[PDB]
Enzyme design. Structure first.
Site, PDB file in Angstrom:
ATOM      1  N   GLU A 116       8.540  -3.148  -0.607  1.00  0.00           N
ATOM      2  CA  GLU A 116       7.134  -3.590  -0.669  1.00  0.00           C
ATOM      3  C   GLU A 116       6.370  -3.330   0.652  1.00  0.00           C
ATOM      4  O   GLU A 116       5.181  -2.965   0.635  1.00  0.00           O
ATOM      5  CB  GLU A 116       7.039  -5.069  -1.080  1.00  0.00           C
ATOM      6  CG  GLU A 116       7.696  -5.406  -2.462  1.00  0.00           C
ATOM      7  CD  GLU A 116       7.303  -4.463  -3.633  1.00  0.00           C
ATOM      8  OE1 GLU A 116       6.146  -3.993  -3.712  1.00  0.00           O
ATOM      9  OE2 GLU A 116       8.167  -4.190  -4.495  1.00  0.00           O
TER      10      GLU A 116
ATOM     11  N   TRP B 112       5.381   0.123   0.578  1.00  0.00           N
ATOM     12  CA  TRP B 112       4.209   0.346  -0.295  1.00  0.00           C
ATOM     13  C   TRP B 112       2.964   0.126   0.547  1.00  0.00           C
ATOM     14  O   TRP B 112       2.017   0.904   0.474  1.00  0.00           O
ATOM     15  CB  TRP B 112       4.187  -0.624  -1.480  1.00  0.00           C
ATOM     16  CG  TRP B 112       4.810  -0.011  -2.654  1.00  0.00           C
ATOM     17  CD1 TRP B 112       6.014  -0.346  -3.216  1.00  0.00           C
ATOM     18  CD2 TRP B 112       4.338   1.143  -3.364  1.00  0.00           C
ATOM     19  NE1 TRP B 112       6.324   0.540  -4.220  1.00  0.00           N
ATOM     20  CE2 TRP B 112       5.314   1.461  -4.340  1.00  0.00           C
ATOM     21  CE3 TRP B 112       3.194   1.944  -3.267  1.00  0.00           C
ATOM     22  CZ2 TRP B 112       5.176   2.556  -5.225  1.00  0.00           C
ATOM     23  CZ3 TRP B 112       3.058   3.049  -4.153  1.00  0.00           C
ATOM     24  CH2 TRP B 112       4.048   3.334  -5.115  1.00  0.00           C
TER      25      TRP B 112
ATOM     26  N   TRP C 122     -16.706   4.061 -19.122  1.00  0.00           N
ATOM     27  CA  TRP C 122     -16.480   2.631 -18.955  1.00  0.00           C
ATOM     28  C   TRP C 122     -17.518   1.834 -19.723  1.00  0.00           C
ATOM     29  O   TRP C 122     -18.667   2.255 -19.888  1.00  0.00           O
ATOM     30  CB  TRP C 122     -16.541   2.236 -17.473  1.00  0.00           C
ATOM     31  CG  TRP C 122     -15.670   3.077 -16.605  1.00  0.00           C
ATOM     32  CD1 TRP C 122     -16.067   4.055 -15.740  1.00  0.00           C
ATOM     33  CD2 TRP C 122     -14.248   3.070 -16.584  1.00  0.00           C
ATOM     34  NE1 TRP C 122     -14.971   4.670 -15.186  1.00  0.00           N
ATOM     35  CE2 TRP C 122     -13.841   4.083 -15.688  1.00  0.00           C
ATOM     36  CE3 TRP C 122     -13.275   2.313 -17.253  1.00  0.00           C
ATOM     37  CZ2 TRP C 122     -12.501   4.361 -15.440  1.00  0.00           C
ATOM     38  CZ3 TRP C 122     -11.945   2.587 -17.013  1.00  0.00           C
ATOM     39  CH2 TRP C 122     -11.566   3.606 -16.111  1.00  0.00           C
TER      40      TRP C 122
ATOM     41  N   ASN D  38       1.593 -11.298  -7.528  1.00  0.00           N
ATOM     42  CA  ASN D  38       1.545  -9.865  -7.766  1.00  0.00           C
ATOM     43  C   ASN D  38       1.641  -9.441  -9.219  1.00  0.00           C
ATOM     44  O   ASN D  38       0.899  -8.554  -9.667  1.00  0.00           O
ATOM     45  CB  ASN D  38       2.601  -9.143  -6.927  1.00  0.00           C
ATOM     46  CG  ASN D  38       2.669  -7.641  -7.229  1.00  0.00           C
ATOM     47  OD1 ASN D  38       1.725  -6.889  -6.985  1.00  0.00           O
ATOM     48  ND2 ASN D  38       3.803  -7.206  -7.754  1.00  0.00           N
TER      49      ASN D  38
ATOM     50  N   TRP E  85     -12.975  -0.132 -12.994  1.00  0.00           N
ATOM     51  CA  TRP E  85     -12.042  -0.773 -12.077  1.00  0.00           C
ATOM     52  C   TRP E  85     -12.744  -1.211 -10.767  1.00  0.00           C
ATOM     53  O   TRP E  85     -12.385  -2.217 -10.187  1.00  0.00           O
ATOM     54  CB  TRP E  85     -10.849   0.163 -11.808  1.00  0.00           C
ATOM     55  CG  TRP E  85     -11.229   1.499 -11.326  1.00  0.00           C
ATOM     56  CD1 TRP E  85     -11.602   2.562 -12.083  1.00  0.00           C
ATOM     57  CD2 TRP E  85     -11.333   1.911  -9.965  1.00  0.00           C
ATOM     58  NE1 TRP E  85     -11.941   3.622 -11.274  1.00  0.00           N
ATOM     59  CE2 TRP E  85     -11.785   3.243  -9.964  1.00  0.00           C
ATOM     60  CE3 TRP E  85     -11.096   1.273  -8.732  1.00  0.00           C
ATOM     61  CZ2 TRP E  85     -12.010   3.962  -8.773  1.00  0.00           C
ATOM     62  CZ3 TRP E  85     -11.319   1.980  -7.547  1.00  0.00           C
ATOM     63  CH2 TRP E  85     -11.770   3.307  -7.577  1.00  0.00           C
TER      64      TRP E  85
ATOM     65  N   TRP F 266      -5.713  -1.498  -7.525  1.00  0.00           N
ATOM     66  CA  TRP F 266      -6.660  -1.291  -8.611  1.00  0.00           C
ATOM     67  C   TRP F 266      -6.561   0.107  -9.166  1.00  0.00           C
ATOM     68  O   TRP F 266      -6.613   0.273 -10.371  1.00  0.00           O
ATOM     69  CB  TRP F 266      -8.109  -1.647  -8.207  1.00  0.00           C
ATOM     70  CG  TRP F 266      -8.372  -3.121  -8.350  1.00  0.00           C
ATOM     71  CD1 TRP F 266      -8.251  -4.067  -7.385  1.00  0.00           C
ATOM     72  CD2 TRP F 266      -8.671  -3.830  -9.573  1.00  0.00           C
ATOM     73  NE1 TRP F 266      -8.430  -5.323  -7.928  1.00  0.00           N
ATOM     74  CE2 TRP F 266      -8.697  -5.203  -9.265  1.00  0.00           C
ATOM     75  CE3 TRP F 266      -8.909  -3.431 -10.900  1.00  0.00           C
ATOM     76  CZ2 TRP F 266      -8.947  -6.178 -10.225  1.00  0.00           C
ATOM     77  CZ3 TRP F 266      -9.154  -4.406 -11.855  1.00  0.00           C
ATOM     78  CH2 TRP F 266      -9.170  -5.760 -11.511  1.00  0.00           C
TER      79      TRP F 266
HETATM   80  C1  LIG Z   1      -4.812  -5.104  -8.553  1.00  0.00           C
HETATM   81  C2  LIG Z   1      -3.943  -5.460  -7.257  1.00  0.00           C
HETATM   82  C3  LIG Z   1      -4.639  -5.876  -6.106  1.00  0.00           C
HETATM   83  C4  LIG Z   1      -3.962  -6.111  -4.919  1.00  0.00           C
HETATM   84  N1  LIG Z   1      -4.697  -6.594  -3.809  1.00  0.00           N
HETATM   85  C5  LIG Z   1      -4.001  -6.778  -2.605  1.00  0.00           C
HETATM   86  C6  LIG Z   1      -4.818  -7.148  -1.390  1.00  0.00           C
HETATM   87  O1  LIG Z   1      -6.019  -7.228  -1.207  1.00  0.00           O
HETATM   88  N2  LIG Z   1      -4.108  -7.391  -0.236  1.00  0.00           N
HETATM   89  C7  LIG Z   1      -2.706  -7.319  -0.094  1.00  0.00           C
HETATM   90  O2  LIG Z   1      -2.099  -7.657   0.927  1.00  0.00           O
HETATM   91  N3  LIG Z   1      -2.018  -6.946  -1.272  1.00  0.00           N
HETATM   92  C8  LIG Z   1      -2.565  -6.660  -2.559  1.00  0.00           C
HETATM   93  N4  LIG Z   1      -1.773  -6.217  -3.669  1.00  0.00           N
HETATM   94  C9  LIG Z   1      -0.393  -6.397  -3.652  1.00  0.00           C
HETATM   95  C10 LIG Z   1      -0.364  -7.896  -3.747  1.00  0.00           C
HETATM   96  O3  LIG Z   1       0.244  -8.265  -4.897  1.00  0.00           O
HETATM   97  C11 LIG Z   1       0.052  -8.811  -2.627  1.00  0.00           C
HETATM   98  O4  LIG Z   1       0.738  -8.060  -1.756  1.00  0.00           O
HETATM   99  C12 LIG Z   1       0.586 -10.135  -2.724  1.00  0.00           C
HETATM  100  O5  LIG Z   1       1.060 -10.373  -4.026  1.00  0.00           O
HETATM  101  C13 LIG Z   1       1.522 -10.502  -1.709  1.00  0.00           C
HETATM  102  O6  LIG Z   1       1.974 -11.816  -1.828  1.00  0.00           O
HETATM  103  P1  LIG Z   1       3.292 -12.055  -0.839  1.00  0.00           P
HETATM  104  O7  LIG Z   1       2.750 -12.010   0.589  1.00  0.00           O
HETATM  105  O8  LIG Z   1       3.922 -13.289  -1.254  1.00  0.00           O
HETATM  106  O9  LIG Z   1       4.092 -10.669  -1.005  1.00  0.00           O
HETATM  107  P2  LIG Z   1       5.635 -10.192  -0.765  1.00  0.00           P
HETATM  108  O10 LIG Z   1       6.082  -9.866  -2.058  1.00  0.00           O
HETATM  109  O11 LIG Z   1       6.383 -11.265  -0.072  1.00  0.00           O
HETATM  110  O12 LIG Z   1       5.433  -8.815  -0.072  1.00  0.00           O
HETATM  111  C14 LIG Z   1       5.441  -8.871   1.396  1.00  0.00           C
HETATM  112  C15 LIG Z   1       4.330  -8.063   2.074  1.00  0.00           C
HETATM  113  O13 LIG Z   1       4.378  -6.750   1.598  1.00  0.00           O
HETATM  114  C16 LIG Z   1       3.045  -6.343   1.314  1.00  0.00           C
HETATM  115  N5  LIG Z   1       2.954  -5.955  -0.116  1.00  0.00           N
HETATM  116  C17 LIG Z   1       3.567  -6.508  -1.221  1.00  0.00           C
HETATM  117  N6  LIG Z   1       3.276  -5.828  -2.301  1.00  0.00           N
HETATM  118  C18 LIG Z   1       2.452  -4.798  -1.870  1.00  0.00           C
HETATM  119  C19 LIG Z   1       1.843  -3.733  -2.505  1.00  0.00           C
HETATM  120  N7  LIG Z   1       2.116  -3.506  -3.790  1.00  0.00           N
HETATM  121  N8  LIG Z   1       1.049  -2.840  -1.794  1.00  0.00           N
HETATM  122  C20 LIG Z   1       0.918  -3.058  -0.482  1.00  0.00           C
HETATM  123  N9  LIG Z   1       1.482  -4.038   0.195  1.00  0.00           N
HETATM  124  C21 LIG Z   1       2.235  -4.869  -0.548  1.00  0.00           C
HETATM  125  C22 LIG Z   1       2.030  -7.471   1.653  1.00  0.00           C
HETATM  126  O14 LIG Z   1       1.480  -7.198   2.968  1.00  0.00           O
HETATM  127  C23 LIG Z   1       2.954  -8.553   1.593  1.00  0.00           C
HETATM  128  O15 LIG Z   1       2.551  -9.636   2.372  1.00  0.00           O
HETATM  129  C24 LIG Z   1      -2.522  -5.946  -4.876  1.00  0.00           C
HETATM  130  C25 LIG Z   1      -1.830  -5.588  -6.044  1.00  0.00           C
HETATM  131  C26 LIG Z   1      -2.509  -5.344  -7.220  1.00  0.00           C
HETATM  132  C27 LIG Z   1      -1.626  -4.974  -8.418  1.00  0.00           C
END
Ligand SMILES: Cc1cc2nc3c(=O)[nH]c(=O)nc-3n(C[C@@H](O)[C@H](O)[C@@H](O)COP(=O)(O)OP(=O)(O)OC[C@H]3O[C@@H](n4cnc5c(N)ncnc54)[C@H](O)[C@@H]3O)c2cc1C
Ligand SMILES: Nc1nc(=O)c2c([nH]1)NC[C@@H]1CN(c3ccc(C(=O)N[C@@H](CCC(=O)O)C(=O)O)cc3)CN21
Length: 469
Positions: free
Chosen positions: A274, A277, A306, A341, A359, A382
């Site tokens: 993650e 990512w 859309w 997430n 979107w 998105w």
């Molecule tokens: C439509 C959509 C919108 C999103 N908007 C955001 C947003 O504005 N800001 C944001 O930080 N994340 C976003 N993500 C991923 C998002 O799900 C979050 O990262 C969040 O769920 C993290 O909660 P956590 O800190 O407990 O994550 P954990 O699962 O504990 O992940 C740890 C760290 O990894 C990073 N991370 C996790 N998943 C992703 C990902 N898929 N892409 C990039 N980094 C990731 C974050 O910085 C996160 O704090 C988005 C995903 C989707 C599907």
């Protein structure tokens, strides 16, 4: 010799590249600057809860910098164009010889920084890639292009990581001049709202403690628990990471310290994936700036017709679609500034693929609420749900909210938490409460599906199909 440290999305003393670099020269005068741009923030749709998080970290930093004997010069202008002038003024007024700052990859932030560097004719500027573990351009393809598929990017990323793992730099030590008295608390002039400080720590030590604890317990169970919204199986460090309360190297080193094999596929490797990512999305906008300009990565998707429908978008935003898992997710967001997430995936899919709404509408709304709002991650998520992005969900992939909900919130625990009006529908039917409502001659104070998934899905497939023609 006067060293100016220009803070932005890095309000921390620990493992801060520009900060540590300014303080190496113990005989240099060190000054810190922070410019509030309430109007550029409004334009960027900054969330009130995040504005609050930043304000809280800003006061806590001011206090910490004072003990190190470093003073913070606070300024508040309107936008990024004005900031250029303020950096120029502060450099001039204090006779700054060197400017140290950590890079920002978004189009508007980069343009500002490039102007600051051009403007500061007699100053030495040093920017640092502090927000990423590996800097953009470190992981390139054979013809020096950025990667378009995650799998090979990840492979190359881990490879370069192994050839030289960046380390955590320490908090600077107290300046020769000794500790000083902190200036009075700052108040950001931007609408702000509160949040749970338990889930989203405002203090630096609290952020670190949360990373520690997660890596010890949570990172091992992560793969098995990360899908259940009713469960606390994620870190909730996204707010700290987005605002700079923590760096990605602190996460990396703390992870490998507790889950040694994380780098080689062992426990903790799924959580690392993650963080890769996150890396991917940041390098990507660095090489594809148009992603910051509302353009899709897959050009033909811009041809999808859309649906312009205010009633449907409003129902989604308020969490009144008639789909429990989608509605509970929106109440979570609207009331805490954060969404699990799995639910960010489901709700984004529902907006774009069941309602066929642009979107960019959902993205903007998410930004406006998200305490962890971040352009690279939000835009990326998105464009993934919409099938317009880089390595996105295939256009024919249309999540079924009922199936999704039955899988990830089988018992309706999460659902019943956020939808009190459904706290009487028995276990399974909770995912389709109105079907059961009639067969019990009951009135639910809950909306009915605003769209039938089966037909919605068909219509959407047709729309993409037609655009992809
Ligand atoms: C439509 C959509 C919108 C999103 N908007 C955001 C947003 O504005 N800001 C944001 O930080 N994340 C976003 N993500 C991923 C998002 O799900 C979050 O990262 C969040 O769920 C993290 O909660 P956590 O800190 O407990 O994550 P954990 O699962 O504990 O992940 C740890 C760290 O990894 C990073 N991370 C996790 N998943 C992703 C990902 N898929 N892409 C990039 N980094 C990731 C974050 O910085 C996160 O704090 C988005 C995903 C989707 C599907
Ligand atoms: N944090 C953050 N930073 C940003 O830079 C950013 C956001 N958020 N959110 C969205 C906005 C809007 N952004 C944009 C949108 C459009 C142009 C744009 O149209 N510029 C063209 C103009 C050319 C013309 O006038 O014909 C360009 O090529 O520079 C630039 C930045 C990026 N933005």
């Amino acid at each position: 010799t006067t060293h100016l440290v220009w803070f932005r999305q890095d309000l921390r003393l620990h493992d801060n590249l520009a900060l540590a670099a300014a303080c190496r020269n113990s005989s240099a005068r060190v000054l810190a600057l922070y410019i509030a741009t309430p109007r550029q923030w409004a334009t960027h749709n900054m969330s009130p809860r995040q504005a609050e998080l930043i304000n809280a970290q800003l006061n806590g930093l001011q206090i910490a910098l004072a003990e190190k004997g470093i003073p913070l010069l606070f300024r508040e202008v309107d936008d990024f164009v004005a900031s250029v002038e303020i950096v120029k003024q502060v450099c001039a007024e204090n006779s700054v010889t060197h400017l140290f700052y950590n890079y920002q990859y978004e189009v508007n932030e980069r343009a500002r920084d490039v102007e600051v560097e051009r403007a500061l004719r007699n100053v030495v500027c040093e920017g640092f890639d502090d927000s990423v573990i590996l800097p953009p351009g470190a992981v390139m393809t054979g013809n020096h292009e950025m990667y378009k598929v995650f799998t090979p990017f990840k492979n190359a990323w881990l490879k370069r990581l192994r050839e030289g793992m960046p380390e955590c730099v320490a908090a600077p030590k107290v300046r020769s001049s000794g500790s000083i008295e902190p200036s009075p608390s700052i108040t950001l002039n931007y609408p702000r709202q509160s949040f749970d400080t338990a889930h989203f720590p405002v203090e630096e030590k609290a952020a670190i403690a949360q990373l520690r604890q997660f890596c010890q317990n949570g990172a091992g169970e992560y793969e098995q628990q990360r899908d259940f919204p009713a469960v606390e199986g994620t870190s909730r460090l996204s707010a700290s990471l987005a605002t700079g309360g923590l760096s990605p190297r602190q996460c990396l080193h703390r992870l490998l310290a507790e889950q040694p094999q994380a780098l080689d596929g062992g426990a903790g490797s799924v959580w690392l994936n993650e963080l890769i990512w996150r890396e991917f999305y940041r390098h990507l906008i660095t090489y594809h700036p148009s992603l910051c300009k509302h353009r899709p990565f897959i050009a033909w998707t811009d041809r999808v017709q859309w649906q312009s429908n205010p009633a449907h978008l409003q129902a989604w935003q308020e969490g009144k679609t008639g789909y429990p898992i989608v509605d509970a997710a929106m109440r979570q967001l609207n009331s805490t500034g954060w969404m699990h997430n799995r639910l960010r995936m489901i709700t984004a899919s529902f907006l774009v693929k069941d309602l066929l709404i642009d979107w960019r509408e959902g993205e903007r709304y998410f930004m406006s609420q998200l305490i962890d709002g971040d352009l690279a991650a939000n835009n990326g998520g998105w464009q993934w749900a919409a099938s317009t992005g880089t390595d996105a969900a295939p256009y024919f992939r249309i999540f079924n909210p009922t199936t999704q909900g039955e899988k990830f919130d089988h018992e309706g625990e999460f659902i019943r938490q956020w939808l009190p009006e459904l706290r009487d529908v028995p276990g399974k039917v909770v995912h389709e409460p109105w079907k059961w409502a009639q067969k019990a001659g009951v009135t639910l104070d809950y909306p009915q599906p605003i769209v039938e998934h089966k037909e919605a899905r068909v219509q959407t497939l047709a729309a993409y199909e037609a655009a992809r023609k």
